[PDB]
Amino acid sequence: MKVAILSGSVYGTAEEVARHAQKLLSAAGLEASHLPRASLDELKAFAPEAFLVVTSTTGMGELPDNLQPLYYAIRDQLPAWHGLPGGVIGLGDSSYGDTFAGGGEQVRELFGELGVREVLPMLRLDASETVTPETDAEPWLAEFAAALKG
């Protein structure tokens, strides 16, 4: 099962979580690839059978500059990804007022518009209350692999 792992990150934290997720999901036997700064063309070539999106929120409440253009491109084209399984990890910040991981939530909304089915609740990580977000994500990733296949 081919799993496309997308990331949105200002300084690299969500990117590192996504990289860790790639290693864990591949260990479990999934064909998982981390596609940082992915284009629509790259995703089309990859032909994903599942999605994992790991994304922080900017100070302006938006998706980071490295995932936002792709978000808009996907929303515009609406590829035929209906029925595929997906999950989201949202790197929130409680100190800043982002407790709920706004970026993550915007990805959930996209999944809805695409017909991608969430297989787990979004993981809400709090970047202001952890120095180990990669390890914090491990229990959720353990269940996510089960949820995909199958």
Side-chain angles (χ1 to χ4, degrees):
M1 192 188 206
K2 299 191 83 173
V3 184
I5 303 167
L6 306 180
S7 60
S9 193
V10 181
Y11 299 116
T13 307
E15 218 114 288
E16 285 312 294
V17 173
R19 182 182 166 186
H20 191 60
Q22 188 280 330
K23 288 172 175 64
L24 306 200
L25 296 180
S26 291
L30 296 159
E31 307 172 68
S33 295
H34 181 212
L35 310 167
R37 312 152 220 103
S39 64
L40 271 185
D41 283 320
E42 188 173 358
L43 283 172
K44 179 171 174 286
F46 188 75
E49 297 172 292
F51 291 94
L52 171 63
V53 183
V54 181
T55 189
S56 59
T57 314
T58 69
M60 295 291 290
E62 304 173 73
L63 287 167
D65 288 355
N66 63 5
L67 182 60
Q68 196 176 339
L70 175 61
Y71 181 93
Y72 282 123
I74 294 168
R75 202 181 181 194
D76 181 60
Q77 296 297 308
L78 280 205
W81 290 333
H82 52 90
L84 296 179
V88 173
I89 296 170
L91 270 78
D93 194 303
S94 56
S95 291
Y96 192 75
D98 186 38
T99 184
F100 61 108
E105 279 295 337
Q106 293 177 43
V107 178
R108 296 185 73 235
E109 291 161 15
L110 187 57
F111 278 7
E113 291 170 333
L114 290 161
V116 165
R117 63 199 173 77
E118 272 183 295
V119 293
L120 291 184
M122 174 174 78
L123 182 67
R124 272 163 58 162
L125 293 179
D126 189 353
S128 70
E129 290 300 324
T130 191
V131 292
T132 65
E134 303 96 330
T135 62
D136 291 351
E138 285 166 359
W140 185 97
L141 288 164
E143 195 60 47
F144 184 64
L148 295 179
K149 205 237 176 269

